[PDB]
Amino acid sequence: GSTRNGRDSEAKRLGVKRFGGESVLAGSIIVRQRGTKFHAGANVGCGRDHTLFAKADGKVKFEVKGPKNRKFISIEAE
Template sequence: MAHTKAQKTVRGNRDSKSKRLGVKVFGGGAVIPGNIIIRQRGTKVNAGPGTMLSRDFTILSLKKGKVKFYQRRGEDFVCVV
């Protein structure tokens, strides 16, 4: 027979929705208090001065200013200046 018969769908064949992680405001970008700078899983980037790390590892701005990324001792940081 040339035709494939109807089959059950495979349970593990579904893909999860994307979580929209990543940098939301890049270096030099203007922010106000409460703006999300980075959405991440774990501390890929650490929170520096003028920022805070929320419980899901999102980095938020605490003051008005410009975003700056830098490295210290091999670690990545973001701050608001």
């Protein structure tokens, strides 16, 4: 008896890193994700693996917006 299975990949540690209402510095990663599950709002940038990073100081603010009801992340300036 022998199995054709048995392989898995090491987990990439995705998810929301800093949650809503948390105060961040400039350049802090907010989420890591595969594709724009969350989109970048004000003062948030999208790096090439679609990583949303805080472009300025302030507090993280999750919201929904737009005609497709897509989830945006903003940084409200302190």
